[model samples]
Target: SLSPRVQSLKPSKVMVITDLAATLVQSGVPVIRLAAGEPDFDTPKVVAEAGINAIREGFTRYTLNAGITELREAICRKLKEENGLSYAPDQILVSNGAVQSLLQAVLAVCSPGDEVIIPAPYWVSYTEQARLADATPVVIPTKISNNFLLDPKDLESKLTEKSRLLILCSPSNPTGSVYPKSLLEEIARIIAKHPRLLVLSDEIYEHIIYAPATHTSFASLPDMYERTLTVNGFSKAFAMTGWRLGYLAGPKHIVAACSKLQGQVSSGASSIAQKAGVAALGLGKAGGETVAEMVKAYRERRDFLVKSLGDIKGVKISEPQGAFYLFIDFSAYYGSEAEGFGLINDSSSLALYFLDKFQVAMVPGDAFGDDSCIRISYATSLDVLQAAVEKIRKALEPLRATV
Candidate 1:
């Protein structure tokens, strides 16, 4: 049996769905996976070549447990240039990835019985990361009609004397809804009222945003600098998910404590990747040049998918402000029944039914704390998306009659 601390963590629900799909794909079955959280794009040529150069130059050794100094400085530069946030390299800790950065940050700050508030339909790890730190996870649910944006009143309601942290993801996962400056300012107003609450602003998808919906880093707002841990990485923006590199910027005490914990927790990220991360920031330093092309591609895919999904009966979806995902309402299909598919109720059955019969893979909303919807990544190619949506249409047809 696992330790009591570990026992609180559930077995990864994603692995079960993904493993079966992987197994079937190995046997040559065509499976279109839209469940992935990473960008489907290849690592940019210049950025990847930096890794090759690092290895050839013998830069492959243990990095500073707090991450390579150059990389840390580059992260600070990137933050100042892009997010309008300022921090010294000493306040930044580059970890194995944003995931590790988050956990270490959580562990460093949270104590047992402390509460960490996460918006519903949040990234899967927020709850787990909070629990791993022995903190109680609190949920503040957002309506799909609101494009899943966190409500300020609800967030304020969740706060208490015991509230220690709030993990907020903008251009959020699953829903891809971005928090505009106005909304963030509203949340910031609420945040100012809670001195006990520190925020973890996961700006992992910062550059992947679309027009009309811009990103506002929680730490960028007035009076918020001291209490926000700005977490970001080369993962989504540079298609470097496998590089296993990410960084966190916060106050000196928090970063120092996180570094103390990180010394034992990880390999300090790959040396080559940290060298390449410098190159990733350089690419961005040229004024979003590297990011523009990818953002355009994701924008096209969003347009196609949102228009197509809306055309389908029994499905209601809002336009995503940023990121490359569509969190769609499938509640209309609930209770629809047919042979083989049986009852079409909740996101789990619908998602499995989609994978089992249609060969289209997506994550159930149950994983994100909402069973009325499903999250689909539009990160795949337009051709693949076209086929997947076609398959999804056919899968829902029989249920429509029942509805």
Candidate 2:
């Protein structure tokens, strides 16, 4: 029997879009999928070669439960170089992915009935993960006027004695908002007052930023180093999502707890993947041309997608600071009635209309706690992205014509 707490949590609705897209494809319909979150690029050549080398050398055995020492050291070096934050190798734990790292952090730091503050619109998994860990997720909703970035005052109000963690995502998924250094510093000041609260800073999309839009690691802030667990990985940055490798760097006590938890569960990340991660973190650093290329491509795609959507009528889109997503407000189309499209009342109906009309699939904003918007991922080829936007524009044109 399922636990009552587990049964109480709502399943993520983003998978609905994915399932629909799959069904469409299975039925011989050509679907432009903008619902999934993954890079379209291949894993870096050096990293792939490293995995191949590991296989050739017969390094197929299980690694230390924490992770390979070389990979952990590389993760430490990456922290120092990228965020100016230092951590001992003992403070690093590699997991299956950043999702596992996040889950482990929540389990280690939070107990039943504890509350965690998450800003909306957030990644779909954050709230669910907290709920699964028996912690209450307190969502602090940010608005389009604020660029969907969390407000320090709002966050301050949400904090209580019961709050045990504040989960921050930069270059955030769904919303694509990046927190500025000044804002982070102010938040750090507010969080410093709550000594019991820990921070889970997800910096997975740190390297995919656009110009004039830089990522500031929360742990890099003053006096926040010891209490913040910086969760990052090679998945997004290096186009290595299939590698299933991610790491967490934090205080020794929390890191040890997470490592112990991981050992009891998954043992360790794949040895070949860890070997490839080492190459990604180490050799990819000196004259790391691959990172620059990927960032450049994402920036270009971001600009192209923003401009394409800006051309569409009745759609209000915020240009994301980082990450390959555009969260567009479809509130304008709500309440509009059109023939054959049914009533457009909520984000789900709007998404269905678009899918039925143009064969373009997008995740509804209701999944991210915002019903007025929908998320469009630009992590595909520029041509495919262009086509998807054009299809979206045409699909919405019928609604706009009625206005």
Candidate 3:
């Protein structure tokens, strides 16, 4: 029999949906995939060339447990320049990806019974990672009216003496909700009241933001430098998801502890990828013009989805100011019985209905700790998105009549 810890883990909903979509596509189904967090664009020329160059130069050996000095320094420079946060190279820990960086940070900070405060609908991994760290995950719900941004009062009410960490993601996964600077300050002030609680700020989607909305480093806020672990990566911005490079910037003690665990775990991030990351940062602020073009396309897609999805009778969408996702409330269509699908009682059922009947794949909001909505990834081209929206509307038309 497996250990209790092994049994407690749940498979990622995003991956399950993506895999199912792929399997169907492989079988010749015309499935429109809106279920992945990946970028459809190719990796930047400079970054890709850097990795190939590193391979040719025979730079594929194991790096320092913390990562190469040059890559860490480049990360430090990117942090200081873009996020207004300063850190020494040694204070950074480069890992396999942002996911590993987050898991290691959680393991490093959390005690067996400590509570990890998370807001829902959150990234699927946050709660699971807390469980992997032997910490209790306490989730606070956010309202769709507020664009699913975490309310400070709800955060304060959820905190306790046992609270050890708060995990926050801006340009958030599942919802695409970016925390405004003013609201962050309010949340920061509340966090300041809890001495035992530290924050892990995930800013992987920092560069993918839409304009009129800016990115702020949580660690850069007043008195938060020592209390925050800033996790970022080249995956979303550089379109280097396959490169699998990310790092954590924080107080030396916590970073060093994560480094120690990392040494025992994977040792360090990929050597070739680290070289590629250096070239990525060398592309200048926000990966220069290459990433800006991607963000521009994403913004256009976001607008189109918001307009089209909003036109649906029962679908409620808040225009996402960042990231390539629209977490739309589809609960109004729930409890309606589709002829062949039977009862569409929840997000998972609705998502499956779309996948089965309409060949449009999306993730159920249930996995993100909220069942009132479903997540649509507009990471693909606008043509695919248009097709997806059409299918989604057609699928919901009958259900809307019942509601």
Candidate 4:
């Protein structure tokens, strides 16, 4: 028998689509996958070598539950210097990844029946993680035209005594919408009105942002320092997804609570990865040249996708200021009929039609709590993105509804 918590969780559609794409490829279909969220770049040489050196030096052993001092210290410095937030090494908890760090923070702070206010079109995991913590996920939908940024007034109306935590993801995962500082200050002002409300700011995509769009750590906001838990990782910027290293920075008590939870659960992150993470932070400011090069490529791909997809009839797209995704509204084709696939009435059906007929794979927006669009990742090569866009355009041409 499955436990209630287990049954309550929805399987990750992102991973599901990735696996389906892989299966199609294995079966000899030429599937152009734009589903998974990860950097296509190699991990920086400095960071990769540090992991090798750590293993060669016999540094493969369980570390302090909170994490090795070296990595934590590096993270603290990076946070202070890059994000303008102050935190000691002890106020950090390194976990398997930012995903685990987020879950631990949720479990630590949320009680059964507590409301976790999450914006729609969120990362697929946020709502499930809240459910795992026995907390209620209160969804707040944002307009796709606004680039999916949370409306502070909408947030204010949703807050209640039962609302324990608010999750803010700038340079967001699926939408790539980076929250500006002015909007963050307004959000902070509203949160200030609720003494019981705390914020978890996920800045995992912070470094991948395009210029003219900047990042602001929620903790840096006035009166927000005490109630914000900042989450970042090596995966995005450093191109070290396999390293499985990420951290949470907050007040001592909250960090300690997450540390204790981690001690009983996964323990400190991989010893070798911790060494590599220190080296990652050592790669000059904001991951040095390697990450800059990767961001440049992502920008090109983003631009390419935006232009190519924007030109498609019946597609609505917003240029992503950061991250590696284009969440395009294909609802214009939602009510159309496909010759062989029957009616395409929602994001799931449209995504499946693209994959099954066009050999292109992408996650439907329903997975992210929005059904009007589908997310296409630009984390692959420009050539792949170029081809995928052509495939998507051709696929939609026949399905476009004439108004």
User: Candidate 1, which segments miss by more than 4 Å at Cα?
Assistant: 401-403
Candidate 4: the clashing residue pairs are: none
Q: What's the CA error at residue 6 for candidate 3, in Å?
A: 1.1
lDDT of 1 by residue, 1-403 (tens): 8799787786555666767778889999989988876677788888899999999999977667888888888888888887888899899998788888888889989999999999988887788888888899999999987888898889867778999898889889878889888888888888888888899999888888887777888999988999999898888889997899888999999999988887766647899999889988887652276778889999999999998878888788978888888989988888888578688778889898998888988889888888888989888899999998899888887776325
| Weakest 10 consecutive residues of candidate 2 by summed lDDT | 394-403
lDDT of each: 0.85, 0.87, 0.90, 0.90
Shift in Å, residue 3, candidate 1: 1.2
Question: What are the TM-scores, per candidate, against the unseen true structure?
Answer: 0.97, 0.96, 0.98, 0.98
Tell me which residue pairs clash in candidate 3: none
Query: Candidate 4: deviation at residue 307, Å?
Result: 0.5
Q: Which candidate would rank higher by lDDT, 2 or 4?
A: 4
Cα TM-score of candidate 1: 0.97
Residue 61, candidate 1: Cα error in Å is 1.8
Question: Per-residue lDDT of 1-403 in model 4, one digit per residue for the tens?
Answer: 9898997789999999999899989988889889998788888888899999999999987688888988899888998889888898899999998999999999999999999999988999999999999999999999987889898888978888899999999899799999999999999999898888999999999999999999989999999999999999989898888889989999999998898888777756899999999999998788878888998999988898898888877778878999998899989887798898889999999999988888889999999999998999989998998898778777777776544
Worst 10 residues of 1 by lDDT: 282-291
